[PDB]
Design a protein around this ligand. Structure first.
Ligand SMILES: [Cl-]
Ligand SMILES: [Cl-]
Ligand SMILES: [Cl-]
Ligand SMILES: [Cl-]
Ligand SMILES: [Cl-]
Ligand SMILES: [Cl-]
Ligand SMILES: [Cl-]
Ligand SMILES: [Cl-]
Ligand SMILES: [Cl-]
Length: 281
């Protein structure tokens, strides 16, 4: 509405880089003491990307409680997300332990396991029904039950079993497989369609634990996903939907995890997706 006006003005004046640097300058700075402990060195994919102490997810088993994951609790929008890095070869057991303990129903993945020929994420789920995965450190079993492969995303039905109790849960794995190798998508149409499939699945419902969202570092594409979803919720809720200030929403989210939205292009894309998604809804 007025957001498109703001959008057109920022585009005309060429000042995406300036707004984005404003956001980085104003962003919260909280301690990450646990993440920086020497014993957690091999639990972090990027030494530059750490969860704050106050919002980090704690693992419940009797062992190091640390995972590079953050609870983003958006109070006005009434939605929570867990943003986490792409699991490492030694943290896949921790990752699925977190899904179990936080009672998540959905996992949202926004990268390919390899992009531009570099690994962005471990192969943390089974690709073949008959070759399940067992995480012996956290005593979990993970089985591919079925998958629905579409042109721009794949949804998988995963069965997660707590081998200690033999309880099982169905986990929906929403994998956006078509984010460009460089830059952001030209159009937000398929990203938005993906978002709405996630919403339609029930995975974002408050009857479940928070959805787990990740890319490689869990702040860039992941940030775009949560930012767009939250702003669209706020535009549906508020009496004056044009009062939704994307920059303020993103600063609120950065109180919970550093670095959300890593480039001015990703900031522009977030505006574009919220503008188009609002029109849709
Ligand atoms: Cl230590
Ligand atoms: Cl992949
Ligand atoms: Cl890896
Ligand atoms: Cl399709
Ligand atoms: Cl980018
Ligand atoms: Cl929703
Ligand atoms: Cl990524
Ligand atoms: Cl706002
Ligand atoms: Cl940043």
């Amino acid at each position: 509405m007025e957001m498109e006006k703001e959008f057109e003005q920022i585009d005309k004046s060429g000042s995406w880089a300036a707004i984005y640097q404003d956001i980085r300058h104003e962003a919260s700075d909280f301690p990450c003491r646990v993440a920086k402990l020497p014993k957690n060195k091999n639990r972090n994919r990027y030494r530059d990307v750490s969860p704050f102490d106050h919002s980090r997810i704690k693992l419940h088993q009797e062992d190091n409680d640390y995972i590079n994951a953050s609870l983003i609790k958006m109070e006005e929008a009434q939605r929570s997300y867990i943003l986490t890095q792409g699991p490492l070869p030694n943290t896949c057991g921790h990752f699925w332990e977190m899904v179990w303990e936080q009672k998540s129903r959905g996992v949202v993945m926004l990268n390919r396991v390899m992009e531009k020929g570099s690994l962005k994420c471990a192969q943390y789920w089974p690709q073949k029904e008959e070759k399940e995965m067992i995480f012996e450190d956290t005593n979990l079993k993970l089985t591919l039950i079925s998958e629905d492969i579409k042109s721009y995303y794949t949804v998988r039905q995963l069965e997660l079993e707590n081998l200690t109790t033999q309880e099982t849960r169905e986990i929906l794995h929403f994998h956006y497989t078509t984010w460009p190798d460089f830059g952001v998508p030209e159009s937000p149409a398929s990203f938005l369609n993906f978002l709405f499939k996630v919403r339609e699945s029930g995975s974002l419902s408050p009857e479940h634990g928070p959805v787990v969202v990740h890319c490689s570092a869990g702040i860039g594409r992941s940030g775009t996903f949560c930012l767009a979803d939250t702003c669209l919720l706020l535009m549906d809720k508020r009496k004056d939907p044009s009062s939704v200030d994307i920059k303020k929403v993103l600063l609120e989210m950065r109180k919970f995890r550093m670095g959300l939205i890593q480039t001015a292009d990703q900031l522009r894309f977030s505006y574009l997706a919220v503008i188009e998604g609002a029109k849709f809804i």
